[PDB]
Amino acid sequence: GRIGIPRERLTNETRVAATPKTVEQLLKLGFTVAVESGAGQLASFDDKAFVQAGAEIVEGNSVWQSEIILKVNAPLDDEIALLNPGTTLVSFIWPAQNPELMQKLAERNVTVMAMDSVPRISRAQSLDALSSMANIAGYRAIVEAAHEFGRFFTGQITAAGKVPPAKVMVIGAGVAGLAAIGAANSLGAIVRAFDTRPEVKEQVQSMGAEFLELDFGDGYAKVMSDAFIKAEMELFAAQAKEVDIIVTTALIPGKPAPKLITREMVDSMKAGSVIVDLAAQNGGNCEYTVPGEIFTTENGVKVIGYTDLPGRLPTQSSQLYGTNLVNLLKLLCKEKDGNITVDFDDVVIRGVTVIRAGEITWPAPPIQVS
Amino acid sequence: HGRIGIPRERLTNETRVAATPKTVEQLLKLGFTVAVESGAGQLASFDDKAFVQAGAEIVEGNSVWQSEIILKVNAPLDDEIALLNPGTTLVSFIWPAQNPELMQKLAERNVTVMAMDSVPRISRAQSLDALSSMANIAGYRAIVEAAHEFGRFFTGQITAAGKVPPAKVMVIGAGVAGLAAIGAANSLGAIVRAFDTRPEVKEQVQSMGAEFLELDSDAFIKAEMELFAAQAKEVDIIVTTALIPGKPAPKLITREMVDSMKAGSVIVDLAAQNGGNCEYTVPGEIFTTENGVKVIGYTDLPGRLPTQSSQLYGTNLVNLLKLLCKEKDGNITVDFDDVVIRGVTVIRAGEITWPAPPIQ
Ligand SMILES: NC(=O)c1ccc[n+]([C@@H]2O[C@H](COP(=O)([O-])OP(=O)(O)OC[C@H]3O[C@@H](n4cnc5c(N)ncnc54)[C@H](O)[C@@H]3O)[C@@H](O)[C@H]2O)c1
């Protein structure tokens, strides 16, 4: 039962699928581990920290000669040839958005587990890589906003005068948004949050933020109605005028991101304001967003549209993601003997297994339990 | 007469301005008018528009120099000194001890110069003390830079994928900048430790929830180095601020201490402009050690928080002018019986009045 951890080859990727701490965990599961030399370097894990944990260091493509491969990103074209039949690959895959990739992997006679396809159910939280990464992205967004902001986040009284706190608006109070709210509140900002779902109001309020209400037959139809989208954009246009920081997190995989902050709203903001657009990978929630870059408007607003926020917390992201993969493996390897049993009676194994022994098993059916 | 000019700064990479729209409002309340050179506030995020809304006039050329008072951040350059008209009062950083030539050229202009670096450090002068204002910004920004460069959470957190511990931060020197760094680090949720040679700061440090570290001349030096060497193995972030007793910065953190730290640690060295407290520091840069520690040696931390630095510095200048202008009629009066004014006045109508007589 050999687990191989390759170096991530997607350009600019700093994360690794295992850390020294998760390797000790994979050994308790009955596996051995080979890590490719240099794989943890950008996440601050050198070869000898892996050796200290109990892994073997290997060079070249020797790492691909293992029963299981743990990666962050999907194998590139030139890495797919290196998968041997009967190998089990665990990575992000995003099957719905990549039929070309799913074809290439199936002709390799491998089993594939997509970390993006973990069922969003309670018992799967400890394996939920999308949530791990979003929590990191939301914290990091505020670090990125503080770095570009030219004023204090924190209110204080100095001998040279009383400094007000920064005002922060967070749009979307899913996982990334809540993490941004938490970080901004920790820095002493006045934080406001909008989310279309009213159920999240007590979460937001407990983390110290104001839940923004709109002016203004089922819920779905209301949030899609012209009236709601008008009230929502007016809310944002008005907040834009008085806040210093906006974090946007409205992202659904595979769909272009809704433009909730227009050129005109950003144009009305105080100079030196910052917008961190966490939907930049799908085009961004802000019309000024240039994915991969910081764009500064003519009125002096910095629109941050980096799409690799977890990769800018690479040590943390590798540790949490790696822990997600460990927790998946605990499920796969119940008796702790280095043997993967891919059991489709377990709903989470079923949800994540998108290829099995050459046969595409994605998509999983709706979960329905007796 | 009663006109204050706010020039655009000329020093390479200077992002600050000596007034904001807010301080402009206050300067008009003291009976002055205000001319701001176009673009002066741009890098600090103060548009010409905001100055005009505050009641300033925007001027183009050396027009700004045709004012009775000039407020700047940095000392005037040669080609600037020649535009100063006799009887003008210049207020800026000057650093007379390091710049005897500049002092002479300003004197020949028959001007009055108040050096914001020469504010006496007595309590009633704190509202004018530009050095504290900037040290406070630098301590905050140091932590902002550390969090930006650091690859782990500062903030302790319980997640579904594990309980993450908080970063451990050691601050060396708990003066104005170290205290600001302590505060910023606390705000981010870190475990903070601090050392100062002055035991009187102990109670301030402890009241911020930080650990004041204790020891175990030259016996003092080595026990201090020994504490730092032990802490360097346990902590993730070091912010180091020990600077200007009247001297190059003491090397408190050696190459061997940095080589000992966990990979991905950050050192922010705020004493970099005097050669730094850290042996790996490269002034004006980040240097990454072979073992993965980022040693931040920026010497312009205040310029990296330009809006805040301009606002506090500019308020410092308003507070100096409230001293010099008690009647609020746009009129400077220099009173040498007031030791704060005696200290800050380095030239008075063409005569060099620095150094001021000794004080306590
Ligand atoms: N009157 C007031 O209320 C007031 C307020 C602020 C500052 N000040 C004055 O201005 C002066 C300088 O300001 P500052 O307090 O920021 O100090 P500073 O910038 O000159 O130095 C930073 C701190 O590091 C310390 N230090 C020196 N060598 C050290 C070593 N080897 N290890 C650890 N720490 C070391 C100092 O004790 C100092 O506290 C002080 O002397 C103070 O009296 C006065």
Residues 6+ apart with CB under 8 A from B29: B328
Q: At A74, list the tokens.
A: 């999907």
Dig out the tokens for A369 from the structure: 């339990």
CA atoms within 13 A on the CB side of B305: 26
Nearest-angstrom CA–CA distance, B341 and B345? 6
Contact B148, B158 (CB under 8 A): no
**Cβ(B143)–Cβ(B239) below 8 Å:** yes
DSSP one-letter string for A287-350: TT--TTSEEE-TT--EEE--S-TGGGSHHHHHHHHHHHHHHHHHHH-TTSSS-----TTSHHHH
Provide the residue type at A218 as one letter.
D
Smallest CA separation from ligand 1 atom 12, residue = B175
Count the residues in chain A. Answer: 370
Place of tokens 């910023």: B184
Select from B133, B161, B262 the Cβ nearest to the Cβ of A160.
B133
Is B149 found in the same domain as B272?
A: yes
Q: How far apart are CA A29 and CA A32, in angstroms?
A: 9
What is the number of the ligand 1 atom nearest to the C-alpha of B221? 31
DSSP state of B151: S
Q: In whole angstroms, what is the distance from residue A202 CA to residue A28 CA?
A: 40
Same domain for B83 and B183?
A: no
Phi, psi of B211 (to 5 degrees): -85, 120
- What whole-number distance in Å separates Cα of residue B315 and Cα of residue B104? 28
Residue written as token pair 């005068």? A161
Contact map slice: B 44-73 vs A, CB within 8 A = 44-47, 50
Answer yes or no: are the C-beta atoms of A21 and A318 closer than 8 Å: no
According to the annotation, is B197 in a ligand binding site? Answer: yes
User: Amino acid identity of A336?
Assistant: K
Asked if A169 and A258 sit in the same domain, the reply is yes
User: Is the same domain home to B329 and B344?
Assistant: yes
For residue B261, the number of C-alpha atoms closer than 13 Å in the C-beta half-sphere is: 29
Output the furthest CA–CA distance in chain A (Å, rounded).
Answer: 70
Give the integer Cα–Cα distance in Å for A18 and A53: 11
Give the Cβ contact number of residue B46 at 10 Å: 28
DSSP E strands, chain A = 2-5, 32-36, 56-58, 68-70, 88-91, 111-114, 156-158, 161-163, 167-171, 190-194, 210-211, 245-248, 274-277, 294-296, 302-304, 353-356, 359-360
Hey, CA dihedral for A177, A179, A185, A187, is it positive or negative? negative
For residue B314, with 0-12 CB atoms within 10 Å meaning exposed, 13-18 middle and 19 or more buried, which class applies?
buried
3-state secondary structure of A254: coil
Return the H-helix or E-strand segment holding A28. helix A20-28
Is A341 found in the same domain as A291? no
If we measure between CA atoms, which residue out of B251, B268, B269, B263 comes closest to residue B289?
Answer: B263
The type of residue at B120 is P
* Domain span holding position A83: 1-136+313-370
Shortest CA gap B144–chain A (Å)? 6
In total, the C-beta contacts within 8 angstroms joining chain A to chain B are: 119
> Which among B273, B289, B304 is the end of a domain?
B304
Kindly state if the Cβ of B252 falls inside 6 Å of ligand 1.
yes
* Domain end call among A270, A293, A312: A312
Q: What is the DSSP letter of B254?
A: -
CB atoms closer than 10 angstroms to residue B252: 23
Closest-CA distance, A126 to chain B, in angstroms, reads 5
Cβ atoms < 10 Å from Cβ of A49: 18
Kindly give, in sequence order, each residue whose CB lies less than 8 Å from that of residue B97, ignoring residues fewer than 6 positions away.
none
Clarify whether residues A181 and A217 are in a common domain: yes
Name the closest-CA residue to atom 17, ligand 1: B175
- This entry's atomic model was obtained through X-ray
Q: Are both A366 and A259 inside the same structural domain?
A: no
Ligand 1 mean position, distance from CA B117 (Å): 15
Secondary structure class of B214 (helix, strand, coil): coil
Residues A279, A320 within the same domain:
no
Task: Judge contact between A245 and A184, C-beta under 8 A.
Answer: yes
Name the residue in chain A with its Cα closest to that of B302. A150
Using alpha carbons, select from B144, B89, B137, B128 the residue that is nearest to residue B112.
B89
Residues A301 and A320 in one domain: no
Please spell the DSSP secondary structure of B281-332, one letter per residue.
--TTSEEE-TTS-EEE--S-TGGGSHHHHHHHHHHHHHHHHHHH-TT-SS--
Instruction: Determine contact: A308 vs chain B, CB below 8 A.
Output: no
3-state helix/strand/coil string of B159-191 = ECCEEECCCEEEEECCCHHHHHHHHHHHHCCCE
Q: Is B89 in the A-facing interface, judged by CB distances under 8 Å? A: no
Main-chain dihedrals φ then ψ at residue B313, nearest 5 degrees: -55, -50
* Residues of A with catalytic function: 120, 125, 128, 131, 220
Q: Tell me how far apart the alpha carbons of residues B353 and B94 are, in angstroms, rounded to a whole number.
A: 13
Asked if B293 and B263 count as a contact pair (C-beta separation under 8 A), the reply is yes
Give me the residues paired with residue A111 across strands.
Answer: A88
Q: Do B171 and B242 form a contact (C-beta atoms < 8 A)?
A: no
Token pair 């590798």 is found at A318
CB contact under 8 A, B312 and A126: no
What is the phi-psi region of residue B173: left when phi exceeds 0, alpha when psi lies from -120 to 50, beta otherwise?
A: left
Verify that B106 and B201 share a domain, yes or no: no
- Of the three residues B257, B280, B304, the one that is the final residue of a domain is B304
Residue B355: C-alpha distances to residues A302, B102, B115, B352 (Å): 45, 15, 11, 8
State how far the Cα of A104 lies from the Cα of A81, in Å rounded to an integer.
Answer: 9
Measured distance CA(B176)–CA(B198) in Å, rounded: 13
Check whether A120 is labelled as a binding-site residue: yes
A315 contact B CB<8A = yes
Rounded distance between C-alpha atoms, residue A195 and residue A214, angstroms: 10
Give the Cα separation of A250 and A252 in Å (integer).
7
| Same domain? A188 vs A269 | yes
By DSSP bridging, strand A68-70 and strand A88-91 are: parallel
Q: Is A348 on the interface with B (CB under 8 A)?
A: no
CA distance B265 to chain A (A): 9
B180 exposure class (CB count in 10 Å sphere: 0-12, 13-18, 19+): buried
Contact call for residues A133 and A13 (beta carbons, < 8 A): no
- Strands A190-194, B211-212: pairing is unpaired
Domain count, chain B: 2
Judged by CB atoms closer than 8 Å, whether chains meet at B129 and A159 is answered as yes
Q: At what angle do helices A175-186 and A129-148 cross, to 10 degrees?
A: 40
Q: Find which of A121, A125, A139, A152 to mutate to test the B interface (most B CBs within 10 Å of its CB).
A: A152
Closest CA to A349 of A133, A130, A119: A119
Q: Which two tokens stand for residue B226?
A: 């020994």
Whether residue B143 sits in one domain with residue B58: no
The backbone torsions φ and ψ at residue A57, rounded to the nearest 5 degrees and listed phi first, read -95, 135
Q: Report how far residue B55's alpha carbon sits from residue B3's, in angstroms, rounded to the nearest whole number.
A: 12
Pick from B303, B296, B307: which is nearest to B143 by CA?
B296
- The angstrom resolution of this structure is 2.0
Q: Residue A109 maps to which CATH number?
A: 3.40.50.720
Q: Is B133 in the pocket of ligand 1 (CB under 6 A)?
A: no
What is the rounded CA–CA span in Å between residue A187 and residue A85?
Answer: 51
- C-alpha span between A345 and B231 (Å, rounded): 52
